[PDB]
Amino acid sequence: MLPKATVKRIMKQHTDFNISAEAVDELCNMLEEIIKITTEVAEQNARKEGRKTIKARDIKQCDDERLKRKIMELSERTDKMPILIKEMLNVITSEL
Amino acid sequence: MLPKATVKRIMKQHTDFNISAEAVDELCNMLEEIIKITTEVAEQNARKEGRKTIKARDIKQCDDERLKRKIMELSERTDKMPILIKEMLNVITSEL
């Protein structure tokens, strides 16, 4: 589990606002979901190369044209999308 | 700066593979970026409602209808996407 005091400390490096305990909890939940799915994808990537060790190369950025299709296809898998993932995407789309 | 040891410990709850230091560092970079943009978007939602406190409601999901539209429009914005956001989106579109 991630330490809530550390997450809130980092949050307050990006805002002067007060931050509720429930808000910190929700970010921690999203962060844990991110750790989970990145690690699972990284393992799948190490497997494709026959490795049993996750390396930096297993966290990938697809070239812009493939990632553009992959996002467009994702736009139509929202109805069964985990809440934590919808929240992440809401943040990413609200920020850009 | 999240503690890299505890992030790797969370990773190992989801994979049996070894994990290199550089992989842990990469994920930590992603997590720090997520903390930043989630807090920045949260503050904006707090402001829109006249508050100076980030609450759980500011880490939000709209509808599956508005989210679907923003994910479509996100697909046309790869060029302004920082690498860390691209890696997050690659993970999300590779996983589930």
Author numbering:
A (entry chain A), B (entry chain B): 1 to 96
Task: Provide passages from the article that reported this PDB entry.
Archaeal histones are dimeric and assemble on DNA into ‘hypernucleosome’ particles of varying sizes with each dimer wrapping 30 bp of DNA. Here, we characterise the structure and function of the histone paralogue MJ1647 from Methanocaldococcus jannaschii that has a unique C-terminal extension enabling homotetramerisation. Unlike canonical histones, MJ1647 tetramers can bridge two DNA molecules in vitro.
To elucidate the role of the MJ1647 tetramerisation module in oligomerisation and DNA binding, we solved the molecular structure of the MJ1647 histone by crystallisation and X-ray diffraction at 1.9 Å resolution. Unlike the disordered tails of eukaryotic histones, the MJ1647 tetramerisation module forms a well-structured region of the protein and is composed of two α-helices separated by a loop. The two helices from each monomer are packed against each other to create an interleaved or ‘hand-shake’ arrangement, adding considerably to the overall interaction surface between monomers in the dimer. The dimers in the crystal structure differ to the tetrameric state of the protein in solution observed in SEC-MALS and native mass spectrometry experiments. This discrepancy is possibly due to the low pH (4.6) in the crystallisation buffer that could favour MJ1647 dimers. By comparison, the distance between positions 80 and 95 of monomers within the dimer of the crystal structure (11.1 Å) is incompatible with disulfide bond formation.
